[PDB]
Amino acid sequence: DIQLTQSPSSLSASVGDRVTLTCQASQDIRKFLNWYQQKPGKGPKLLIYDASNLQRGVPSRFSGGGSGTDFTLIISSLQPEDVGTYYCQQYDGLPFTFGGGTKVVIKRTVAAPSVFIFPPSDEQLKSGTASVVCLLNNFYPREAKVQWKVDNALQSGNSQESVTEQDSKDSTYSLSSTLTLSKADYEKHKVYACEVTHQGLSSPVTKSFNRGE
């Protein structure tokens, strides 16, 4: 089996930047090499076939080069809609194989999150479990700290975060943190607070509520 090695694994660049993705084959595959783009939750789309041919309908800012073992995909001017994963693929010989992919990530200006907190619904308590949700909407960069406090007590080990894929239009992220505790515990305490720390905020922002208000 021919191995294709893509580097780097992940690449960050600013809109307008000239970007170069590389593919190395473990053996000489001449020009029998294709490039695909895949956006999260979507099927791949062909960009370049046989090393250097731009597929019909693909924007001209994409170009491909190389032969033998060393190949490049070049994006002459990175656009926000370009975020996603890029794969090379070889058909010199069966089995057909793909590179492990290079993820492209946009660098943009800082943008502070808007923060919202949600108490558990009545239907859910009715069933013995309490989920408290914190939402950080449309921010950049991705790194954020979300700290839970119950009656001012710093919580840990009972929350999970999820983060959206980088937005294709404005290159921001959104994040949710879910604090889960039993109905018993939720009923113990009164003040529930989400404290968010982020580069776009001059100081931590807190959203909270009082149970049953």
Partner 1 sequence: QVQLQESGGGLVQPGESLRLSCVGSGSSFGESTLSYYAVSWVRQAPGKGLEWLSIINAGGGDIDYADSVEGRFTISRDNSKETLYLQMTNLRVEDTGVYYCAKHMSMQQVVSAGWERADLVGDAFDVWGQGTMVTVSSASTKGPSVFPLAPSSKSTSGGTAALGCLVKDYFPEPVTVSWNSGALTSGVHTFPAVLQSSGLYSLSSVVTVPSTYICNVNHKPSNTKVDKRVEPK
Site residues (vs partner 1, CB under 8 A): 32, 34, 36, 42-46, 49-50, 55, 87, 89, 91, 94-101, 114-121, 123-124, 127, 131, 133, 135, 137, 160-165, 174, 176, 178, 180, 207, 209
CA triple 127-128-130, angle to 5 deg = 105
The minimum distance between CB 100 and partner 1, in angstroms, equals: 5
Between CA 40 and CA 44 the distance in angstroms is 10
The minimum distance between CB 127 and partner 1, in angstroms, equals: 8
Task: Please name which of 40, 44, 43 lies closest in space to residue 164, comparing C-alpha atoms.
Answer: 40
Strands 205-210 and 153-154 turn out to be: unpaired
The minimum distance between CB 99 and partner 1, in angstroms, equals: 7
Between CA 31 and CA 66 the distance in angstroms is 7
Q: Are 79 and 61 in contact (CB under 8 A)?
A: yes
Closest to partner 1 by CB, 78 or 130: 130
Closest to partner 1 by CB, 69 or 131: 131
Closest to partner 1 by CB, 28 or 100: 100
Q: Which two tokens stand for residue 42?
A: 């979507």
Closest to partner 1 by CB, 44 or 65: 44
Residue found under tokens 């909270």: 208
Closest to partner 1 by CB, 82 or 97: 97
CA-CA-CA-CA torsion sign (40, 44, 50, 52):
negative
The minimum distance between CB 170 and partner 1, in angstroms, equals: 12
CA triple 71-72-77, angle to 5 deg = 170
Q: Is 24 exposed, middle or buried (0-12, 13-18, 19+ CB in 10 A)?
A: middle
The minimum distance between CB 40 and partner 1, in angstroms, equals: 9
The minimum distance between CB 60 and partner 1, in angstroms, equals: 18
Closest to partner 1 by CB, 55 or 63: 55
Q: Are 29 and 97 in contact (CB under 8 A)?
A: no
